[PDB]
Each structure stands twice: as C-alpha cells, then as structure tokens.
Amino acid sequence: ALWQFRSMIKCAIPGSHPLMDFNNYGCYCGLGGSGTPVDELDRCCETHDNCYRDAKNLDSCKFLVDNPYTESYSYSCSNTEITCNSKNNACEAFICNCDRNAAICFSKAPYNKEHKNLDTKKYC
Ligand SMILES: CCCCCCCCOS(=O)(=O)[O-]
Ligand SMILES: [Ca+2]
Ligand SMILES: [Cl-]
C-alpha cells in the first residue's frame, strides 16, 4: 500500500519527505511516465513502474482488482533496513519487494533539485 511505501522510504531515508520529495520528480517518479529517465533516481521509479506492471500481470495477484498501491502487505523496519515479512502471501510479497527495492534504490541515487517538478511535456 502507498502509505506503507511512504513509511518504508522514511525508514531507509530518515529525514525524508516521500511525497514532497518523490512525486513529480523526473519523468517517471509520479503518476505514469514516459521518455528517457533523467537520472539514476528517475530510473528507480521507471523500474518501480515496471515492477508494478508485472505485478498486475502476476497470476498470484489475480484477485487483486486495483492498482498495487491499494494492495496492503507486511513489512518491518530496523536501522533503516527494510524487511518483507514471510507472512506475506504471493501477491503481497511481490508488491512488497517492488517497494523495498525502490526505497533502497531511492536511498542510493543522487537527488537533483533541478529534476524536480520537471516540465514533462518539454523534456519527457
Ligand atoms: C499525484 C499524487 C497522487 C497520490 C497522492 C497520495 C495518494 C495516497 O494517499 S494515502 O492513501 O494516505 O497513502
Ligand atoms: Ca510513475
Ligand atoms: Cl512511481
């Protein structure tokens, strides 16, 4: 679930402001996205959007009727270490990892204020 995603990011990147920070960033961090990613971070989101694309096409998520951001799952945090609990079932585990990997990715990609609120129509 999205709330869990924001929570997950706040775990891997402490003083973070997930939504303020990762929405409308680059050409992929946000609703949808196209064009060439603008940097390592924008790439993290491209990967995340593909992971969510596979998720819906996953047999294990056949009963999930909406966007993966509505799929709730089970994760824990410890020392900015994100764990996807084994109690998660197929679809959840999967979606949990799309998120986890994204948080980790986000925490290791440079952040360039210039790529925030980028003009998509003009550069994507
Ligand atoms: C352009 C941003 C769209 C998504 C905004 C946040 C939607 C979810 O809000 S939440 O259910 O408390 O995690
Ligand atoms: Ca996106
Ligand atoms: Cl995204």
From Swiss-Prot:
A GO cellular component annotated for this chain's UniProt record is:
cell surface
Q: What is this protein called?
A: Phospholipase A2, major isoenzyme
Q: Where in the cell is it found?
A: Secreted
Q: What is its main location?
A: secreted
The activity regulation comment is: Regulated by bile acid salts. Up-regulated by cholate and down-regulated by taurochenodeoxycholate.
EC number(s) on file: 3.1.1.4
Similarity remark:
Belongs to the phospholipase A2 family.
What post-translational events are described?
Acylation causes dimerization.
